Design a protein around this ligand. Structure first.
Ligand SMILES: [Mg+2]
Ligand SMILES: [Mg+2]
Ligand SMILES: [Mg+2]
Ligand SMILES: [Mg+2]
Ligand SMILES: [Mg+2]
Ligand SMILES: [Mg+2]
Ligand SMILES: [Mg+2]
Ligand SMILES: [Mg+2]
Ligand SMILES: [Mg+2]
Ligand SMILES: [Mg+2]
Ligand SMILES: [Mg+2]
Ligand SMILES: [Mg+2]
Ligand SMILES: [Mg+2]
Ligand SMILES: [Mg+2]
Ligand SMILES: [Mg+2]
Ligand SMILES: [Mg+2]
Ligand SMILES: [Mg+2]
Ligand SMILES: [Mg+2]
Ligand SMILES: [Mg+2]
Ligand SMILES: [Mg+2]
Ligand SMILES: [Mg+2]
Ligand SMILES: [Mg+2]
Ligand SMILES: [Zn+2]
Lengths: 178, 175, 37, 141, 130
RNA sequence: UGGCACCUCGAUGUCGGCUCGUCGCAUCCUGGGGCUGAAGAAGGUCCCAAGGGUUGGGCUGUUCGCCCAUUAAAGCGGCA
RNA sequence: CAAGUCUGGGCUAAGUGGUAAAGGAUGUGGCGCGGCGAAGACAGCCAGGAGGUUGGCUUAGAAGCAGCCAUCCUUUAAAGAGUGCGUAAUAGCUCACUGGUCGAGUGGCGCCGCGCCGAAAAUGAUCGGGGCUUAAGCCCAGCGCCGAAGCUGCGGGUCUG
RNA sequence: CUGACUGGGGCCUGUAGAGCACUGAUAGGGCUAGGGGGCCCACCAGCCUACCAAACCCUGUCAAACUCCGAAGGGUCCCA
């Protein structure tokens, strides 16, 4: 939220990304405009401002762009972003991945598993007005054998549901005994 | 944070501090001392207090400020007999009798150790169970007291050692 | 202990002193003092 | 140790170790990850020695995740044997790894215990392997 | 003043007319019972004047900017920090100085304590009937 | 012990012993010191230190190795 | 040994330069984040450093301290079913938490450049040598110069067209 | 004037890279042909499996003898 933008006109940018200015591009239906953003601003807001939050982008034309992230290319033996694909949202039920989480006792806390399969809560498409910030999933009693999620009780409030599948969701794993 | 030298000297019985353009000579009611000073750092000799001033901030100006002040601060109370520096001895049958200045003492050896003192060191012996080393300068007393430590090493499973104040943290017994 | 290549702070009251070029680590109890060498 | 039970061919080559990662940088399973920085090989003895050093370290909770699998047979000739006369015997399968690939991923272990556990298993490997946590650097859209 | 505002508001709101602004522990004669001598007036006038105090020039500067300044005692010497509210105040002051200064080493009551929208004195506080 | 085959096939004599030494320390002792599950002696380990010593024999061609009597010790290696 | 003890900005105190790794360390110099702070901050020196509570057969013994439950509350101007010892367990010493007379800065980090230890072999040692510390090393620059049998200045011969 | 080489046009490949749709191995999760079996019941009239496990689907991988893909280049032919 509230990040500055600039322009690119087919530059060098491997030489421009030395002082913390990684390139980018944004679009909703057209106008594939090449931009570059700042790395400590984008990284600092990108600490907690995840995929679910609409990161808005000030532009020198005076517009505030409701963007989000499409991909962050890892530098892969440097752990850095090369290029981040922004996505402007328009009057359209666009796709969203919302990091929902789990609250409650996992499996009767002493006899508890791990509950590690977050997987970014596979897909929810939404209108730009009914877009959420947080949706809650509880883990009320889910001990080791039975009581799995299986995405059957995956009715979120409103808009929308998961479109095609109901198969990828968290489960309970046994611990590591000695 | 307070760098030593950001707080002043002032000294009643106001002993004389002179220029001595590379060093510091201090003359008091009892004796005179000597403090070497780095020539780049400027200590000044104003009324009452002895000021200290450093040029810049590196690994020598930030430590020599505080070295140079504090070695004067030892010589402030040094020339007015401000050091007692006891050495209390333990032992079943240990004592330290004095003949003149060469302090012989029985520390369990086959011969009483004759301690030859240097110039300006007074072995005040009020008790057979404790002595004290006096003088003028703190280095001259602590070095000779370390030489008294050089005979007998304490904390070897039991008593019969010296501790400079008395501090048995020796170790567990061995039965 | 005694002369080791790695120096770590067992029993957190260690003080780490770099004297005469090399690293010593000292405590009250002398069975935990270390020299790096 | 562990080994692949079936193969198309028994012996295979060595190749080179260039390339950046070819997949395996995002964690996506656990909250922490032991990521490598130098190109080398991972023997099954290095897998076992690092896997035992987790379950013996932390107990009663925390599932350990390994994302390495040895499919490359390390070929070594017997001792005091002259050159030629075919390849050597197969002793233990090794796993090729690239820099910036996450090998070991703890699960259900806290900060001050997972830094320590990944620090213990970091010394079992011949690679400078730094430790990364769960960040927002996933590949989601 | 960054994290300590509600804690300063627990001694800078109802303190419009303080009482025992004397000396706290100060080595000699400091509780040493933890039942009646520690809380002093809790064996008589309950717990409505047993300080709450994290200040001597901290929130006391806020109390010296709010209403008046209550009283002026330790600000250069060493006497820790002691506050109150009301409760007994003019009533059981000799009992509070008897349980707070009934033993210890001699009589460590309170240096300059306030008394009902004004101030107190040293002789009137230590050797006072009010 | 090996791998390689780079000078040596108009050849650079191969094991071991006797005499004669010299050098390194990653020290067997003697000289200092820290720790110890170091009460003292005798110990264990580690740091510095190569200045000097490192026996007389039986066995087998033996280097090595196994035993007798001692010493504080009967060190490991290089120098074709 | 022919040519700058050249002009600038930093860096290194190890002879690194001028011998190599895993690992380790208040070694320095630079960048960014967080808390605290002159409604007085860190290390300091003094403080009643606590009541249910030795919570419960815990196998002798479980008083915070071999290891278990489901992890408290309330008295307070700050305090747990306790930070390390020390006890068979006790007791006790220090406390995490905090009150001041002081004093204007104070800790955890993530990178980054040069460093230290790791680094012990056999005739006499050394980076070529002597020597070298705001350099006679290392990083970014700039203007010159030295520097071949290379190219041009000139002369002479040969071969091909 | 065709040559080495270069410029403008085509054609070809299955290497680097990348990928699992094909050939195999695979870290987990869900479903469970069935099997030591069944809590044990007039055997099918079940129940959870913390017992094993076929096949399938996802989150994740690896490959000289795997390619749904696929360059940089090289070769060849026409003109300069
Ligand atoms: Mg050889
Ligand atoms: Mg050959
Ligand atoms: Mg010949
Ligand atoms: Mg021959
Ligand atoms: Mg021959
Ligand atoms: Mg040695
Ligand atoms: Mg040795
Ligand atoms: Mg010795
Ligand atoms: Mg002994
Ligand atoms: Mg010699
Ligand atoms: Mg010798
Ligand atoms: Mg010259
Ligand atoms: Mg080196
Ligand atoms: Mg310069
Ligand atoms: Mg020519
Ligand atoms: Mg010519
Ligand atoms: Mg042509
Ligand atoms: Mg051609
Ligand atoms: Mg071409
Ligand atoms: Mg291929
Ligand atoms: Mg490949
Ligand atoms: Mg082509
Ligand atoms: Zn310590």
């Amino acid at each position: 939220y509230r990040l500055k933008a600039y322009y690119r006109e087919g530059e060098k940018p491997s030489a421009l990304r030395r002082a913390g200015k990684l390139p980018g591009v944004m679009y909703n239906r057209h106008l594939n405009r090449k931009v570059y953003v700042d790395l400590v601003e984008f990284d600092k807001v990108f600490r907690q401002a995840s995929i679910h939050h609409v990161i808005v982008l000030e532009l020198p034309d005076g517009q505030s762009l409701p963007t989000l992230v499409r991909q962050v290319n890892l530098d892969k033996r440097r752990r850095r972003p090369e290029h981040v694909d922004f996505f402007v949202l328009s009057d359209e039920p666009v796709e969203m991945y919302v990091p929902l989480r789990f609250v409650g006792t996992p499996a009767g806390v002493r006899a508890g598993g791990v509950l590690q399969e977050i997987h970014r809560d596979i897909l929810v498409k939404v209108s730009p007005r009914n877009i959420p910030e947080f949706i809650e999933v509880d883990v009320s009693g889910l001990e080791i054998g039975d009581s799995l999620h299986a995405s059957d009780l995956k009715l979120p409030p409103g808009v929308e549901l998961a479109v095609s599948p109901e198969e990828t969701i968290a489960a309970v794993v046994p611990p590591e005994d000695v | 944070m307070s760098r030593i030298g950001r707080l002043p000297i002032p000294v009643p019985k106001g002993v004389s501090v002179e220029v001595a353009p590379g060093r510091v000579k201090v003359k008091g009611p009892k004796g005179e001392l000597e403090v070497p000073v780095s020539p780049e750092m400027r200590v000044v000799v104003e009324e009452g207090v002895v000021r200290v001033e450093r040029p810049s901030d590196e690994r020598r100006h930030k430590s020599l400020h505080g070295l140079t002040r504090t070695l004067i601060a030892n010589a402030v109370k040094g020339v007015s007999e401000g050091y007692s520096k006891e050495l209390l001895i333990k032992g079943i049958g240990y004592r330290a009798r004095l003949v003149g200045r060469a302090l012989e003492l029985t520390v369990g050896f086959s011969h009483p150790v004759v301690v030859e003192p240097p110039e300006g060191i007074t072995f005040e012996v009020p008790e057979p169970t404790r002595v004290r080393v006096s003088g003028i300068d703190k280095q001259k007393v602590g070095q000779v007291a370390a030489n008294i430590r050089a005979i007998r090493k304490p904390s070897a499973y039991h008593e019969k050692g010296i501790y400079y104040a008395g501090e048995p943290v020796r170790l567990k017994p061995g039965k | 202990m005694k002369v080791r290549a790695s120096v770590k702070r067992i029993c957190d009251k260690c003080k780490v002193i770099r004297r005469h070029g090399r690293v010593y680590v000292i405590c009250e109890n002398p069975k935990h003092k270390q020299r790096q060498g | 140790m562990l080994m692949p039970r079936r193969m198309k061919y028994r012996k295979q080559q060595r190749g080179r170790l260039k390339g950046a990662t070819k997949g395996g940088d995002y964690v996506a399973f656990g909250d922490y990850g032991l990521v490598a920085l130098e190109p080398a090989w991972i023997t099954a003895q290095q897998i076992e020695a690092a896997r035992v050093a987790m379950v013996r370290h932390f107990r009663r909770g925390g599932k350990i995740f390994i994302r390495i699998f040895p499919d490359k047979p390390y070929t070594k000739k017997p001792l005091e044997v002259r050159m030629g006369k075919g390849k050597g015997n197969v002793e233990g399968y090794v796993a090729v790894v690239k820099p910036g690939r996450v090998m070991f991923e703890v699960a259900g272990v806290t900060e001050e215990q997972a830094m320590e556990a990944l620090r213990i298993a970091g010394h079992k490997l011949p690679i400078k392997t730094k430790i990364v946590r769960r960040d927002a650097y996933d590949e989601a859209q | 003043x960054x994290x300590x505002x509600x804690x300063x508001x627990x001694x800078x709101x109802x303190x419009x007319x303080x009482x025992x602004x004397x000396x706290x522990x100060x080595x000699x004669x400091x509780x040493x019972x933890x039942x009646x001598x520690x809380x002093x007036x809790x064996x008589x006038x309950x717990x409505x004047x047993x300080x709450x105090x994290x200040x001597x020039x901290x929130x006391x500067x806020x109390x010296x900017x709010x209403x008046x300044x209550x009283x002026x005692x330790x600000x250069x010497x060493x006497x820790x920090x002691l506050x109150x509210x009301x409760x007994x105040x003019x009533x059981x002051x000799x009992x509070x100085x008897x349980x707070x200064x009934x033993x210890x080493x001699x009589x460590x009551x309170x240096x300059x304590x306030x008394x009902x929208x004004x101030x107190x004195x040293x002789x009137x506080x230590x050797x006072x009937x009010x």
